[PDB]
Amino acid sequence: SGKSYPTVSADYQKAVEKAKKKLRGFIAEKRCAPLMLRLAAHSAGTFDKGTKTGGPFGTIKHPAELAHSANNGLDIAVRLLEPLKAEFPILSYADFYQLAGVVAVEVTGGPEVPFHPGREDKPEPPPEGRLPDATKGSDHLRDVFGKAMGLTDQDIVALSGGHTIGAAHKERSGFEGPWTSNPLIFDNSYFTELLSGEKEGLLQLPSDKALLSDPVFRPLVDKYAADEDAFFADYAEAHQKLSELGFAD
Numbered sequence: 073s074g075k076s077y078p079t080v081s082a083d084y085q086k087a088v089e090k091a092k093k094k095l096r097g098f099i100a101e102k103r104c105a106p107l108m109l110r111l112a113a114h115s116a117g118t119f120d121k122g123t124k125t126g127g128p129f130g131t132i133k134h135p136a137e138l139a140h141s142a143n144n145g146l147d148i149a150v151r152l153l154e155p156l157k158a159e160f161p162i163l164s165y166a167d168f169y170q171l172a173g174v175v176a177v178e179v180t181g182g183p184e185v186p187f188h189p190g191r192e193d194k195p196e197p198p199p200e201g202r203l204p205d206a207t208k209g210s211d212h213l214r215d216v217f218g219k220a221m222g223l224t225d226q227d228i229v230a231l232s233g234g235h236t237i238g239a240a241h242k243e244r245s246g247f248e249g250p251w252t253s254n255p256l257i258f259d260n261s262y263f264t265e266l267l268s269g270e271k272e273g274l275l276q277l278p279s280d281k282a283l284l285s286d287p288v289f290r291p292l293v294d295k296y297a298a299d300e301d302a303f304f305a306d307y308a309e310a311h312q313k314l315s316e317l318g319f320a321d
């Protein structure tokens with residue numbers, strides 16, 4: 073909604089198509105889908121709607137942005153992608169990283185998130201401190217996703233489901249371990265696990281737990297735990313919106 077996508081050349085679109093295929097093979101082989109999804113989200117989640125600053129515009133590769141404590145470990149992701157990115161000099165880094173996030177979801181068995189090219193690489197990284205804080209709750213989630221990014225309550229719960237793949241690392245955030253028993257499979261298990269309680273070996277952040285006690289978020293958690301198809305639909309809508317923050321209006 074509200075989007076007017078820019079025109080790109082036929083050669084640009086050719087490169088998008090080829091890069092999508094190469095990303096599938098690379099991400100599957102390297103087992104790095106969750107890291108690439110986190111990279112795409114950290115690139116995009118810095119958007120502030122009031123000022124029109126931050127967002128998915130290639131700035132995460134800058135040494136100054138990688139230095140941010142919230143971005144611990146994402147230097148690995150940027151380095152992993154550099155050889156492949158160099159095969160597609162016509163593409164912006166901004167588009168490349170968002171394409172990698174879309175592919176991460178697809179190769180782990182998730183929905184096909186629509187992708188539109190044309191993001192420009194911008195000079196100035198956003199200020200530090202805009203990304204969500206795992207130790208806070210529902211008010212904080214609405215401040216970051218709602219007041220800054222401009223996303224809905226539905227988007228917040230669906231996007232939290234991205235944690236269905238991957239794990240935390242004590243050397244990165246400090247939290248440790250996977251949210252699910254199948255951390256390379258994109259499914260609704262994040263929500264099933266959140267409901268069943270604190271299982272041995274699995275992770276729940278305070279920000280995950282905040283979904284369970286909020287009057288708006290909880291019915292969404294229940295819906296996604298019962299209906300994977302509904303989760304996939306809402307997730308695809310939310311990821312597309314996140315990947316396009318500040319882009320094409």
Ligand code: HEM
Nearest residue numbers: 106109110113204205206231234238239240241244245279
């Ligand atoms: C809702 C607010 C969010 C909070 C509080 C949060 C917090 C965190 C934290 C603390 C980690 C662990 C980092 C580490 O130690 O390696 C993490 C990892 C991850 N996050 Fe989030 N995040 C949020 C939103 C998102 C969103 C919107 C997405 C994408 C849709 C996402 C995708 C991921 C993925 C895939 C990982 C696993 C990374 C890996 O396996 O290396 N997160 N998140």
Ligand SMILES: [C-]#N
Nearest residue numbers: 110113114203
């Ligand atoms: C997660 N960032």
